[PDB]
Amino acid sequence: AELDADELKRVLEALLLVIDTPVTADALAAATEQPVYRVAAKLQLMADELTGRDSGIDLRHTSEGWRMYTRARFAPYVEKLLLDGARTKLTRAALETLAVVAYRQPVTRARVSAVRGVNVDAVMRTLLARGLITEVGTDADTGAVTFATTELFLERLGLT
């Protein structure tokens, strides 16, 4: 069994993909049945090519061995992508109560709770934390804080 330059590169790509921690040239060498000097060289050539095209992937060598990393300049994109998981979509109940605030704008939660026919603290909270609505003032007659949809609401929704 023997792998030419192009084959060795392939196998190494497959392997560098499945690892969750750096691997050693020796581990790869053994796994692939090749001389380590050959693997060591190949990894540095594959790393050279990737940074040669400024790939999103950066193959770097550390005391723990070799591993594919995210190229520096792309951190910002990595950050956002993951964070766009922290908060799941809005439930229909939530949109429902969002609409109530939207269409009745200055509204106390007491009227939102009544109009929805249920307690709305959980949904109010999330709507608040997500900046879709906010405290505007208070009701003169009752002294209960009033609410309104933010500007961001007009955005995530459409237009302004």
d(CA 16, CA 25) in angstroms, rounded, equals: 11
d(CA 75, CA 93) in angstroms, rounded, equals: 35
> From the CB of 98, what's the least distance to a copy of itself, in Å?
20
Contact predicate 58/49, CB 8 Å = no
Total binding residues for a copy of itself by CB under 8 A? 33
- For residue 14, give every residue at least 6 positions away whose Cβ sits within 8 Å of its Cβ, in sequence order, or none: none
Tell me how crowded residue 68 is: count the other CB atoms within 10 A of its CB.
18
Contact predicate 145/133, CB 8 Å = no
User: How many Å is the Cα radius of gyration of the chain?
Assistant: 28
Hey, which residues between 63 and 102 contact a copy of itself (CB under 8 A)?
Answer: 68-71, 74, 77-78, 80-82, 84-85
Binding to a copy of itself by CB under 8 A, coded x per residue (else -) over 103-142, reads ----------------------------------------
Contact predicate 151/113, CB 8 Å = no
> From the CB of 104, what's the least distance to a copy of itself, in Å?
30
- Residue 45 engages a copy of itself in binding (rule: CB under 8 A): no
d(CA 89, CA 16) in angstroms, rounded, equals: 34
Contact predicate 59/43, CB 8 Å = yes
> From the CB of 111, what's the least distance to a copy of itself, in Å?
34
- Residue 17 engages a copy of itself in binding (rule: CB under 8 A): yes
> From the CB of 155, what's the least distance to a copy of itself, in Å?
14
- Residue 11 engages a copy of itself in binding (rule: CB under 8 A): yes
Find the binder of a copy of itself among 44, 55, 113, 134 (CB under 8 A): 55
Q: Which is nearer to a copy of itself, 71 or 116 (CB)?
A: 71
> In the complex, which residues of this chain contact a copy of itself (CB under 8 A)?
9-19, 23, 27-28, 30-32, 54-57, 68-71, 74, 77-78, 80-82, 84-85
